[PDB]
């Protein structure tokens, strides 16, 4: 069972409201593990502060950040709820494979 | 109005909800507030 991650994915990737700072943390990271370890506390803030005040969770569109994001942001400095979206994003990955 | 007369507003015209949808996204309203809107954007879709 994987339908509530799925439906909150489907819910950020058709709104048309994404932020656009996520293209350039995306762009600006190109998945790198060091470039993406020095901007931890940022994204954590993105994405905790995009989920409260709108009901998406950000840098899904990108699968370089939903990995380090589901691997590094995982030791605390995280609501949980939030990691095991992702952790539930890149489990599918691993079901679907 | 919503939170007194538990009715959303501004319903009654296109123009309206769709410039709602589109320009008050970035916080303002609570998030289900917005999200009637956005659904009422997406019926339309729909409906095309």
Same mark, same amino acid.
């Given at each position: 069972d994987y339908e509530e991650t799925l439906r909150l994915f489907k819910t950020t990737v058709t709104s !048309?409201?994404? !932020?656009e700072l996520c293209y350039l943390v995306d762009v600006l990271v190109h998945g790198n593990v060091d470039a993406f370890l020095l901007i931890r506390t940022f994204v954590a803030r993105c994405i905790v502060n995009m989920f409260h005040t709108r009901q998406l969770l950000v840098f899904a569109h990108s699968y370089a950040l939903v990995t380090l994001i589901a691997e590094?942001?995982?030791?605390?400095?995280? !609501? !949980?709820q939030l990691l095991f979206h992702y952790r539930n994003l890149v489990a599918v990955l691993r079901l679907v494979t």
């Open positions: !048309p409201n994404y !932020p590094h942001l995982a030791d605390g400095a995280l !609501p !949980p």
